[PDB]
Amino acid sequence: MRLIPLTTAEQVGKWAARHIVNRINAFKPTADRPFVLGLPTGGTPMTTYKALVEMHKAGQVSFKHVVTFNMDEYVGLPKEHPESYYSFMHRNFFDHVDIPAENINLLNGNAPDIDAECRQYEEKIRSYGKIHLFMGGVGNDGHIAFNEPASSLASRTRIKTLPKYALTVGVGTLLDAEEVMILVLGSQKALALQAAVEGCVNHMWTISCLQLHPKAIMVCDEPSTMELKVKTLRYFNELEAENIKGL
């Protein structure tokens, strides 16, 4: 596991954005072999989308052959409603880049057959093969997306009771990704960061199971490191010193 210790939310976004750009440019996606990106919404990834957009506008990356899968969506909420995940994603990212509509995958919270919708979502991911990079956030209690603490590590896309319900990818869906990058911002995430980095593996703090994942990265700001031991932060600061230059 990697822990990228940065100071501000803006630096985290710039670091995360650059990592995504580098993975894409190294993969060199084409129509027949697209780069598959898993994505989150909310306040946490705000600075990352902002950074991704300026990099695209500077000509550093193209999303023409990038396929995305989002983590969740509200049930029964009109897609064009300003508070839907769909609206958030277009407003903060899709409206500003060259990704084609057919490459965008968002759960349809208005699907007639909920169980069928979730099933097809998992099917769509497998049709491509695998998610190359899945970016996410982490709950104050260490949970992922709308998955509950003590969720099975093999859980799949399904409906969850918090609108009244939401569709969310499962922990297994996230773990099947080739690489997982979690954005950690704020002192309210300090206990979750501690559980992920210093604690032992346990299903109550879902984030701790990333210790078993082949390629996991935590990108965090200063306030989120409050519960770590001084030597833990020092260790990652020194090891990652050359990789945070320029952010």
Place this chain on the structure above:
Amino acid sequence: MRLIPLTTAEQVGKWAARHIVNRINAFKPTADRPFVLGLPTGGTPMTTYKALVEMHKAGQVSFKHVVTFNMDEYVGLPKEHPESYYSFMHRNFFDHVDIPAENINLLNGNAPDIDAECRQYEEKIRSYGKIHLFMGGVGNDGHIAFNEPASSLASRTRIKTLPKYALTVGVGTLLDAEEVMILVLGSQKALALQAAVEGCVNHMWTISCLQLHPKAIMVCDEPSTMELKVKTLRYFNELEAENIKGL
């Protein structure tokens, strides 16, 4: 992982029995595709077998196309002896339902080649493919069947020194099941329940490794929850409130 918090041993048996019945009826087993059930013996599963039998007698389930695999048997003990696992299983379950003899699998503690017997048992399970549901109990120290604490998670059916010896399925045998349901009864199992639900993954408390299993369920009575935090029990009580109605 699911934790079904109930009050009495009788409720646990009724809940466990209904879960087995529902899995069977949803699977709709036939001669060519039987539902494979893993089973334990002893005082712990008593109320569950009792409940399974009345459900069968009420016409709610048929074991005609259910194949069973038991966890253990004593070595050198006459099969028809009243204290054998064979006698226990027939007396408490097989004597009262419509399962055919060819669908019953019990380790032969009188086999001439012990190692061959255990090897064939594993072979029999694979011939069917997989155990759909494996029900078991848990030791005071968190162990499973006759497996020792610190047993390998990939251990297989073998002989164990406690009669003098016994044949027991391994932890790997149990983990390969599609779903694992552990019955937890009594305050003497309180530390084991705590290790399974709140503790971290560790090979000393074998039960804790179910946290890594794709579909694990703990069904417990009130006395067994003594070592859990009040909020842990409250959390599962609320989440499972709708699934324990009627038991």
Place this chain on the structure above:
Amino acid sequence: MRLIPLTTAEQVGKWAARHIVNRINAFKPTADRPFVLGLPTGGTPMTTYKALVEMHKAGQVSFKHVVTFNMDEYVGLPKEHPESYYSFMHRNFFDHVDIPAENINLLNGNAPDIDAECRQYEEKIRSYGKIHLFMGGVGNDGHIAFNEPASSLASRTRIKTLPKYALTVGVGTLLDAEEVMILVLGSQKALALQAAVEGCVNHMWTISCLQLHPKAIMVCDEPSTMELKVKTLRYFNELEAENIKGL
């Protein structure tokens, strides 16, 4: 997991050597199906190589059809230099047994393309299929070879900054072995032994992840048991009592 509690470094070497000999003789390797052995260097395995050599000289084993893979090598250091891993392995083992040069695999710290060298090493292992037994040591902080604490459990052979650099097999490389045997000597390894045997699974103490491995063995001397609970040592002493007779 097995824990073989012995008194001295010499006993550990004799026990480890005999275990290797027994695995080889039971496997009965041939030119078309060789026994693949993973090996470490340093002060820790000294008594084991010494024991392996006398067993070979007594006619108890032949390495004619044994293929070896070593854990590491220094970068840019002349192969014939007295401090290289190559020199250590020949001087302490290869010079005294009947293993053919083509069966010896050591990382080439002088390869022009470092990344290619490491890639081919992994390729060579897969060409044989799998390492049947990988023997290693453990760092004071629980690390393996030159892998850092918090290394990914799927890490592979690569270059590491400590000469200035070294090539080292990854944790995944080690875990892919059919059986892993770690030699633990000295009170300085007491905290690592404790983490491996009594602690919970966590990526900070890499050795703790052997709890998830299908066949792991820790062979230790008396000074290394300082951090274990008296009952833990008593438990393994009794369980392994019959397997340490004669060492």
Place this chain on the structure above:
Amino acid sequence: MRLIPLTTAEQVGKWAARHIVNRINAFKPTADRPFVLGLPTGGTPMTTYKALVEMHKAGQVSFKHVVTFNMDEYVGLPKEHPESYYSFMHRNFFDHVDIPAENINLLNGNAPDIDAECRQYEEKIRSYGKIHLFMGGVGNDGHIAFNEPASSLASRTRIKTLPKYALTVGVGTLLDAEEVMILVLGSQKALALQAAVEGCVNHMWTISCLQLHPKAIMVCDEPSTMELKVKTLRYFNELEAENIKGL
């Protein structure tokens, strides 16, 4: 230590009030030997003052010979200001009972010599000899009054930087009381209750040092027991069952 597990804030107040009444009536205070009561302010003791007042109005207790000492007061804030501790105490308690003005002791946040004011407060307590019962609340982090975590257990009345400052009795001032009763309400106090009852003595959670006090009582509501083990709460519930009847 005693732990009185009750359900609601109202029950806690009724239990605490009755305990104070019983201590007073058993002490039988007179002009020459008054019963000395330490008191807190805020939302926590609201139901207790309410209960104390109705008991007084029912003729169950008289405060004619009861001397009180309050925990704190704001600095530079006009005494008659509606938000002062003085205003709170009169409005919620003194306005409704028969305690004489000369028996009321409140820190003067407008004293010209702050250090002298605090010094005299301690002097006043010693002039009476000792506080017979000191009632207080507890911070989310286990602190007492305005004392900081890691405060000396012998700290005394002094000014503290949070108005801008406040005068607060010290931990030593509280511990010198013959009996200490802490009101614990709300899930936000759950970690503090756990530290006080189940944790070990440590200066970071000041409340934990009451374990060393000769006569300490925690009176809590249901939401505050969230972090205790089920068996801990069960133990106190059974032991105190006869003392909570009627509240």
Place this chain on the structure above:
Amino acid sequence: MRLIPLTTAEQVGKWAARHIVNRINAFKPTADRPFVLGLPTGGTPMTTYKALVEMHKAGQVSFKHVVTFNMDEYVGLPKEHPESYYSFMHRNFFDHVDIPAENINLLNGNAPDIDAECRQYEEKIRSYGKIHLFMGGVGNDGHIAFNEPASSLASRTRIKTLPKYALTVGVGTLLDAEEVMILVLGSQKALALQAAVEGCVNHMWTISCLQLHPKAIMVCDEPSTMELKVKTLRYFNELEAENIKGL
């Protein structure tokens, strides 16, 4: 604190007896200045009384000017009943030594005024001044005598609900002794020994508060050391090696 690690219950008794004898002979008690000894009953101190008696019979000590105070007695049970603490003490100790009746203090479980009886017991101890050495045992949960876990460290002699009731000295009564020596026998006391020696101070395990006592000694047998770290036992074994020679 001292920890005397011995092998058998007999050795513990011989060590404890010799310690008592040495303290007495060094004190050189007279009619005006007697040596005050606190004593327990039950299976635990059996080998110690046996050893004390043979030492007396060998002329190594006289109890002519030794005053004793016992920890408890049953309420309402006839003093001469074979199961009373009185009968146990005479049968195992007083019947065999030269202590005068006026020097023996046992709680009167048949006293008309229970509270008065307990009050006078404390008064009797103070009349002498202090207990020079108090020997006791420890509960499986770390408790002392009939004091409950979480008992106040300043608790005094009082009646306790387990006959139906018993009179028991308090924790404060024990702590006021100049020296406290606790006999620890059996694996069932392993967790209590661990809490006393390696754990932190906390009122739930009363025995842990002896860490704060000026002169505490734990005398234990081998089975009771099961929960200690190997290095902890090694440390005390080496430090006390010269003081256990001859037992």
Place this chain on the structure above:
Amino acid sequence: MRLIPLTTAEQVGKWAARHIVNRINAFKPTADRPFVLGLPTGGTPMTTYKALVEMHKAGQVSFKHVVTFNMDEYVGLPKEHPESYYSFMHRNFFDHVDIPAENINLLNGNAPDIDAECRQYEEKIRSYGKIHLFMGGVGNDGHIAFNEPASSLASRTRIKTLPKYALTVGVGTLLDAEEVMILVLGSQKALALQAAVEGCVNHMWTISCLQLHPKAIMVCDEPSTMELKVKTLRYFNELEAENIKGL
């Protein structure tokens, strides 16, 4: 307790020296009422003595009416030997200030009656009444002076087996001081600092018992904070920010 987080050993010495100077100048010692200072030796207090001497040379303090008591001395070692505590104290402190010989107290490691020497040392301290400030260091295992881990908190000056022996003040001797200031330097003291500040009270880490002392201060450098949580250090850094200006 106070924790003064500084960066270098030199800053620690300057802070500690100034604190001593301020305590002396506020006390205003005279021939009839001297300021009593407890002192340590070794590498740890080096920068503090250096700072104390320049302050004296600058006219900021006089030791004319300061009485000192040192923690230890070697047994049987010639007082004027260059490695004695006597030589260290004169060479690093007494040779440079105006303290009179009669105000200096050092244990006489060559006294004919060891036990008498230690007894008189304690007597000398009481003759003055109390040590106003005792400065010391801390062992890697949390011990004080030559006191062993698990030493009684009431231990007194006595001989200790490490020359072969040394005379050392006891933990009780240190705790009886009005104020205790411990200098903490180096990463090797990180675990001890953690036990003192964040851990719970326990006799194995003697330094942790300072949590119970009325006025304890830890003055530490940066390397010693390695085992503290980032938020712990942040908390003390902010609280002590105004008291470390100028060092």
